[PDB]
Design a protein around this ligand. Sequence first.
Ligand SMILES: CS(=O)(=O)N1CCC[C@H](C(=O)Nc2ccc(Cl)c(F)c2)C1
Ligand SMILES: *[C@@H]1O[C@H](CO)[C@@H](O)[C@H](O)[C@H]1NC(C)=O
Ligand SMILES: *[C@@H]1O[C@H](CO)[C@@H](O)[C@H](O)[C@H]1NC(C)=O
Ligand SMILES: *[C@@H]1O[C@H](CO)[C@@H](O)[C@H](O)[C@H]1NC(C)=O
Ligand SMILES: *[C@@H]1O[C@H](CO)[C@@H](O)[C@H](O)[C@H]1NC(C)=O
Ligand SMILES: *[C@@H]1O[C@H](CO)[C@@H](O)[C@H](O)[C@H]1NC(C)=O
Ligand SMILES: *[C@@H]1O[C@H](CO)[C@@H](O)[C@H](O)[C@H]1NC(C)=O
Ligand SMILES: *[C@@H]1O[C@H](CO)[C@@H](O)[C@H](O)[C@H]1NC(C)=O
Ligand SMILES: *[C@@H]1O[C@H](CO)[C@@H](O)[C@H](O)[C@H]1NC(C)=O
Ligand SMILES: *[C@@H]1O[C@H](CO)[C@@H](O)[C@H](O)[C@H]1NC(C)=O
Ligand SMILES: *[C@@H]1O[C@H](CO)[C@@H](O)[C@H](O)[C@H]1NC(C)=O
Length: 337
Amino acid sequence: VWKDADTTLFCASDAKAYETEVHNVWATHACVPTDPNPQEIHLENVTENFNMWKNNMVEQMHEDIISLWDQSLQPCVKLTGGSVIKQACPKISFDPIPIHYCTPAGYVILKCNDKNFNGTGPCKNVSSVQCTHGIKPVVSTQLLLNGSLAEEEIIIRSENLTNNAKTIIVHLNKSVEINCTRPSDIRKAYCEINGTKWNKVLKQVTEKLKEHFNNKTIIFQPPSGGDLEITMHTFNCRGEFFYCNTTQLFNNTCGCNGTITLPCKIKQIINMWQGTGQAMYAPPIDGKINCVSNITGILLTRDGGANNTSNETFRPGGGDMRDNWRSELYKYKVVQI
Ligand SMILES: CS(=O)(=O)N1CCC[C@H](C(=O)Nc2ccc(Cl)c(F)c2)C1
Ligand SMILES: *[C@@H]1O[C@H](CO)[C@@H](O)[C@H](O)[C@H]1NC(C)=O
Ligand SMILES: *[C@@H]1O[C@H](CO)[C@@H](O)[C@H](O)[C@H]1NC(C)=O
Ligand SMILES: *[C@@H]1O[C@H](CO)[C@@H](O)[C@H](O)[C@H]1NC(C)=O
Ligand SMILES: *[C@@H]1O[C@H](CO)[C@@H](O)[C@H](O)[C@H]1NC(C)=O
Ligand SMILES: *[C@@H]1O[C@H](CO)[C@@H](O)[C@H](O)[C@H]1NC(C)=O
Ligand SMILES: *[C@@H]1O[C@H](CO)[C@@H](O)[C@H](O)[C@H]1NC(C)=O
Ligand SMILES: *[C@@H]1O[C@H](CO)[C@@H](O)[C@H](O)[C@H]1NC(C)=O
Ligand SMILES: *[C@@H]1O[C@H](CO)[C@@H](O)[C@H](O)[C@H]1NC(C)=O
Ligand SMILES: *[C@@H]1O[C@H](CO)[C@@H](O)[C@H](O)[C@H]1NC(C)=O
Ligand SMILES: *[C@@H]1O[C@H](CO)[C@@H](O)[C@H](O)[C@H]1NC(C)=O
């Protein structure tokens, strides 16, 4: 009694209308207040098919996050091509907030509750919703932060495991904490990670990929070329862009179960993930910067040519932030009634 049809969604959130936080301020006038009585109703004995890769819900989320960042973050010198802008860049307050996506009249969001759903194929436990759930728009590379965990075992999401061009999204079932600090060289910082927890999870991820890869041996080597943005766990902490060398995490060696410390730097000059170009920001806040986050997902790529070798090699990746969003909109699909 329905049909697949992509249209314009709208958004909702608990954005505090008094907070100056840029996500709050932008959500105070680009989104409607939250659904007071959310009503998730189940669809008895139904089966509909999902494809988290050919989902237009991301393409819409992408545009919003682009708008949020374009309105909010103030660079001292925005640059493009055949143009150079030189505005101001004061001290802000950054901290993502959950925003809910919603469907207008005549349409509805279908949700996939199969716990072991890989993102693609038929879904047996389908329930409809008027809006999604709170989704923090967190921008990052290699690791996915402050995300939603799985409800069973690790999941391997890829549009096509056969193609090495396609990225691999590893959905963890156990969040691993990351703790990054710049104490009172002002651009030097470090991230602390529990080696024990991590190596175990990584060992779990190893066997999970063996299953999908004919028991071949796997190796986690570091990135193979690219910009500093892509070869470093790039993210944002309280406004300041952090660049973290994850070489310790991606090794096949792991007395290596204490506290893994990763060296980081706060960069003022970055390569925008919108593609636009490069941008420069002010020094950091006069004090002690600190963010504690949950490692939820992992973003990997695989090298080709190994159809006659024994083992398989994966490197942490990213770049396209659509995968960051698609890591949250995988279970949703928009249908018109
Ligand atoms: C055009 S691009 O998509 O190939 N590519 C260009 C180079 C780097 C870009 C990027 O990832 N920037 C980026 C910036 C800030 C943060 Cl906090 C982050 F996590 C990432 C992506
Ligand atoms: C369907 O999903 C719901 C919500 O996640 C959960 O209670 C359970 O996994 C399933 N319930 C039934 C009756 O199949
Ligand atoms: C996901 O499940 C479908 C079956 O519904 C299967 O064809 C596909 O290969 C699976 N993909 C991965 C990455 O496991
Ligand atoms: C981190 O994960 C724990 C459970 O694993 C959860 O209770 C907590 O809210 C998460 N924190 C964030 C910031 O997502
Ligand atoms: C996570 O998944 C692995 C297999 O992928 C499983 O062995 C493990 O028990 C799971 N852990 C949790 C906390 O669900
Ligand atoms: C997966 O990728 C391979 C290699 O690029 C390609 O030849 C094949 O057609 C793809 N398979 C599917 C099912 O899309
Ligand atoms: C994070 O690390 C800082 C310094 O490395 C430490 O003072 C703080 O207690 C840590 N916080 C958590 C939640 O682990
Ligand atoms: C690592 O996690 C274990 C539990 O798996 C916990 O007992 C310990 O405090 C953690 N150690 C570090 C160094 O984070
Ligand atoms: C992988 O090896 C296990 C035994 O270690 C075997 O039971 C299973 O059939 C193999 N699977 C694949 C896909 O090769
Ligand atoms: C990360 O550190 C390792 C040594 O710990 C070094 O070999 C590597 O070049 C560093 N990564 C980058 C992107 O410079
Ligand atoms: C993740 O959430 C925690 C708690 O809400 C926050 O302290 C931290 O800054 C967040 N990390 C990122 C990268 O947004």
